[PDB]
């Protein structure tokens, strides 16, 4: 558990209808939601592979006369044992894979947060609920740059330095 989905980000955005993980920005030119398409696509591919792996990893009765009770009981024992084993396997697989999937999504959100943190550095302040408040004026080009991963730290360095 990485403490992001129910942790320092306490709620999911129902207005971000573009992906699983993403950004909400508020500048002077406006507000809006924008999903991170790379991370969402990778997560979707991995979950599709997980489901496929689960599915691709996975008969009448016999009649006995009254003087064959032992082999009848042996047949019932075989059938019941295989049924118990397969039921146990199915439940256990589902129970473990659900944990793993939820942890995978939590890790995705936390890694996205860390990636954004490692770019802005001291040019922004961490509020603690997931949001960074800039010490400089970031236009839409600034926001896209942060989302792309090509943030120009030296450009907005002195301007942020004066306000901090």
């Amino acid at each position: 558990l990485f403490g992001a989905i129910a942790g320092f980000i306490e709620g999911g955005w129902t207005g971000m209808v573009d992906g699983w993980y993403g950004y909400h920005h508020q500048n002077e030119q406006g507000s809006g939601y924008a999903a991170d398409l790379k991370s969402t696509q990778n997560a979707i591919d991995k979950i599709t592979n997980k489901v496929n792996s689960v599915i691709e990893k996975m008969a009448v009765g016999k009649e006995f006369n009254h003087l064959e009770k032992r082999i009848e009981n042996l047949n019932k024992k075989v059938d019941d044992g295989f049924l118990d084993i397969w039921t146990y396997n199915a439940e256990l697989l589902v129970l473990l894979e659900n944990e793993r999937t939820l942890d995978y999504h939590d890790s995705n959100v936390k890694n996205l947060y860390e990636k954004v943190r490692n770019q802005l550095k001291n040019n922004a302040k961490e509020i603690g609920n997931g949001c960074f408040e800039f010490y400089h004026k970031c236009d839409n080009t600034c926001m896209e740059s942060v989302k792309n991963g090509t943030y120009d730290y030296p450009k907005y360095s002195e301007e942020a330095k004066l306000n901090r």
């Epitope: 992906g19 999903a35 969402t40 989302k147």
Partner: antibody, heavy 115, light 104 residues
Framework: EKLVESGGGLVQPGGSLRLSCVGS????????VSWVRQAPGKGLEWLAG??????????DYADSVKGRFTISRDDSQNTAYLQMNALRTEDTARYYC?????????????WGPGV | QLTQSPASLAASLGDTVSITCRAS??????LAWYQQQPGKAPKLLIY???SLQSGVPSRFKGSGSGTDFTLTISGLQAEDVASYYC?????????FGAGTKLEL
Amino acid sequence: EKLVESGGGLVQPGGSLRLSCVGSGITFSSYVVSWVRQAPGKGLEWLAGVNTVSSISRTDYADSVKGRFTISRDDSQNTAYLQMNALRTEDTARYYCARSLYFYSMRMDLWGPGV
Amino acid sequence: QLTQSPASLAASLGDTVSITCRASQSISSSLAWYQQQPGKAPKLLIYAASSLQSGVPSRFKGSGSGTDFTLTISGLQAEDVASYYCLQQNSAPYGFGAGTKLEL
């Protein structure tokens, strides 16, 4: 791993026709299905789109067929329907169904053969 | 509104081909590039304006963000003679480009 289109054919002008796109697998409730037509001689044209049941924007249409066409979904039977009403001569084309997994922003990489 | 620039182009084997798409608004890297041969379903070549679909040869490259996008075919081969379409996956009514027909 496959999408099959059925329900096409000849129709009189001013008539109606319902096309169905059926998918093979277990993950159809994930699909965000879309219809794209190609008129003989013309290019590819995005027509309709049905989203997942748990989404907000459940259905979208192009401006050319808004009000006449209706897209719908049936996850129990693994099918997406396109109802065309007040059909015109300009609607003679080949209709394809495409899926893009959970959102309309993802790869639209599974196309049906056409009908 | 997506405008596909060449709309027709004749090129020889081994040459480099550039197809350009322009968008009325800003679509942040939400363009896809499809190749269609006549009477067959379209095939995805590029998604997210720069990502190469699995199985597609590396001759196909995509570039551009915002309103200008480019699809480059380096080392044209005879199997690359087909129509090319650009799909926009950003705004509520989605659409394709006009269509570029690549000939010899």
